[PDB]
Design a protein around this ligand. Sequence first.
Ligand SMILES: CC[C@@H](C)n1ncn(-c2ccc(N3CCN(c4ccc(OC[C@H]5CO[C@](Cn6cncn6)(c6ccc(Cl)cc6Cl)O5)cc4)CC3)cc2)c1=O
Ligand code: HEM
Length: 527
Amino acid sequence: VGEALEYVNIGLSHFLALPLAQRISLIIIIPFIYNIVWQLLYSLRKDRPPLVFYWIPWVGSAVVYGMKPYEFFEECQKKYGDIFSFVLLGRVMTVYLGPKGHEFVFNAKLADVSAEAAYAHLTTPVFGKGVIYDCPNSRLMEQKKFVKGALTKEAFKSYVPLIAEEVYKYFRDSKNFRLNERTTGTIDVMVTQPEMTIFTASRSLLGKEMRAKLDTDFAYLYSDLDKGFTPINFVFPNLPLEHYRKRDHAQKAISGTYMSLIKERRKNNDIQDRDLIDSLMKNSTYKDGVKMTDQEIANLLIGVLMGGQHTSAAISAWILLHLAERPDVQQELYEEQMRVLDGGKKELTYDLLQEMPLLNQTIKETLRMHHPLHSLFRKVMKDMHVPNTSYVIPAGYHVLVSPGYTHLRDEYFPNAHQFNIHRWNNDSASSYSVGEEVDYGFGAISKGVSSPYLPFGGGRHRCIGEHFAYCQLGVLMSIFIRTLKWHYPEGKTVPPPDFTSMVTLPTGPAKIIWEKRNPEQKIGGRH
Ligand SMILES: CC[C@@H](C)n1ncn(-c2ccc(N3CCN(c4ccc(OC[C@H]5CO[C@](Cn6cncn6)(c6ccc(Cl)cc6Cl)O5)cc4)CC3)cc2)c1=O
Ligand code: HEM
């Protein structure tokens, strides 16, 4: 009876007097044992979705999920159906696949889930404080409104010639091309596209000064800042190491430069309508009267530029890679250019961009096959019951949604792993609210998010960058197509995606060989 409790205390005491060898081994064994025990008991619960079994505690299914998340999702879906959890480096991720999954996560009430609690630890160090995910959602909603205010049809009309100019400059000056000197060459598209993207997006969103500053050793700070933008930071945001310091330094130095330009313009009253900076200078007052600081303005510009950097660089990379084994498509895109721009005797404008459906379909189809963000997350804040199920997702869990996975299902996109731009005949718009709409603070967007095609997400956290992305990728590709033909080195094909990077970029080196359609044509201007 009571002799039992004595031997508990005795057994407790003999424990701590075990040989240290057996002691260190014990400290490994019993959480291992317990984990299996706990998993097995968890399986009983009918108000929890299935949990993918894992051996190593805490680590969970991290390695298999990290390397091939869609193959992992496919497997889990065969066995368990569309709702299932899995452990990932100390967190419980509840996946919900398919259009119902989109509905569950993207249209989750503000009360139930938090994007900032899922994302802030990565982004805040990189972008800086007070903006995006380092603030309440209603602040974010309004920051998105402010940014959108520089992303208008008239802005795109003026961006097009500037982006065009940057792309031509790059063909002229970059070692990777130099078209006034070489008629053919080889490039790594994972070198060329990040540079082309930063050059074109700096010039148009940030302006001529911030573009100019890229022709200096200031450019090294973007590289530094970029290295804090990696998934590692989702779990180790701050570690006393050098690249964590090069990041912190870069955020300060880059934001300082933007603040310098901003304060400079206010000084001379040079606030026009040129770029996103001008725009945020005129329009960054919240509905409660608080103005964003010059520091928050600058931090937001870093965020925006960083966001648009990696998604677009990735996509232009993939477009080049898919087109390299598809001279039929290159030929077809080339004809559309000849028709819409009168054999090239018409200058590219934003309006004419809208009359190039095949081009835009190519972007659309590349966005389907290569969603740059394979997993979007939220942290669960209030217990969530899953509709038409017994399941309840408790606070402290995370939900994971993956439209990119659905993009690659034959059920919704017949022959989903074939690149086919003609599957978007009669549907070349970047996206569009198929029905009723809703405004979270940054404009009216689709109310339903059940579309199997969701390259830009949906709900309150929806992308506001899609028309800029289409504008930028569209001018870029229009010119690539008109200027060059390109193909793979012998025996090379489309590389598989890297799923461990921030975006699903191509696995390197991803090389193509280009050649000038007109070996004799020259790009003017000085260099
Ligand atoms: C350790 C073992 C190894 C095998 N392993 N184990 C696990 N993993 C792993 C897991 C998951 C992932 N990732 C990939 C990246 N991913 C992700 C990245 C960015 C992201 O961004 C969401 C928010 C914040 O950033 C932006 C991105 N963006 C959207 N449009 C443009 N960019 C964002 C929004 C707004 C602004 Cl202003 C800027 C930015 Cl960057 O949206 C969401 C998910 C999460 C899963 C990678 C590796 C591994 O590598
Ligand atoms: C091909 C290009 C891009 C794709 C496919 C893409 C995709 C996405 C997706 C899926 C989301 C939602 C994330 C989530 O719900 O967790 C998102 C959010 C967002 N993106 Fe993009 N993006 C692209 C480019 C851009 C560009 C160019 C900009 C700015 C110019 C931008 C700015 C933003 C912003 C401000 C948000 C809101 C984040 C939030 O509300 O939490 N993106 N994007």
